[PDB]
């Protein structure tokens, strides 16, 4: 499966899933991340 970005974490799609890379998710330029676990992060203003 390709991954989806977590809207409830405020994530946006950066790059789409290709044959050789999963979906890349991130935040907007003025935000920063908090990692709740290795994989799960949230975007804050």
Numbering used by the authors: 72 to 116
Task: Please share excerpts from the published article on this structure.
Here, we describe the chemical synthesis and folding of a central, cysteine-rich domain of the cell-surface receptor tumor necrosis factor 1 which is integral to binding of the cytokine TNF-α, namely, TNFR-1 CRD2. As this central portion of the receptor contains a significant number of TNF-α interface residues,11b we envisioned that it can be synthesized individually and serve as a truncated mimic for the TNFR-1. Cell-surface receptors, responsible for converting external stimuli to cellular responses, are critical targets for physiological investigations as well as diagnostics and therapeutics design. While recombinant routes for preparing receptors are most frequently used, chemical protein synthesis has unique advantages for research by offering atomistic control and fully breaking the barrier of chirality.
Here, we present a synthetic route to the TNFR-1 CRD2 protein domain using a one-pot chemical ligation and refolding procedure. As the linear TNFR-1 CRD2 polypeptide contains six cysteine residues, there are 15 possible combinations for disulfide bond formation. The highest refolding yield (33% by HPLC) was achieved by preparing a solution of TNFR-1 CRD2 (0.5 mg/mL) in 6 M Gdn·HCl, 0.1 M sodium phosphate buffer (pH 6.5), 6 mM glutathione disulfide, and 60 mM glutathione, which was then rapidly diluted 5-fold with 0.1 M phosphate buffer (pH 6.5). Subsequently, we conducted racemic protein crystallography to analyze the structure of TNFR-1 CRD2.4 This technique involves crystallizing small proteins from a racemic protein mixture to gain prompt access of high-resolution structural data.15d,17 Here, enantiomeric TNFR-1 CRD2, prepared entirely from d-amino acids (d-TNFR-1 CRD2), was synthesized following the protocol developed above with an overall yield of 16%. The racemic TNFR-1 CRD2 mixture was subjected to sparse matrix crystallization screening, and the best crystal-forming condition was identified to contain 25 mg/mL of protein racemate, 1.5 M sodium chloride, and 10% v/v ethanol. The crystal structure was solved at 1.4 Å resolution, confirming the correct disulfide bond patterns with well-defined electron density. The TNFR-1 CRD2 structure aligned well with that of the entire receptor TNFR-1 in complex with TNF-α,11c showing a backbone root-mean-square deviation (RMSD) of 0.36 Å across the cytokine binding interface. The binding experiments with human TNF-α (Peprotech) showed clear binding to l-TNFR-1 CRD2 (KD ≈ 7 nM), with no binding to the d-counterpart. Consequently, this indicated that the TNFR-1 CRD2 is structurally conserved, and its binding to TNF-α suggested that it can serve as a receptor mimic for further investigations.
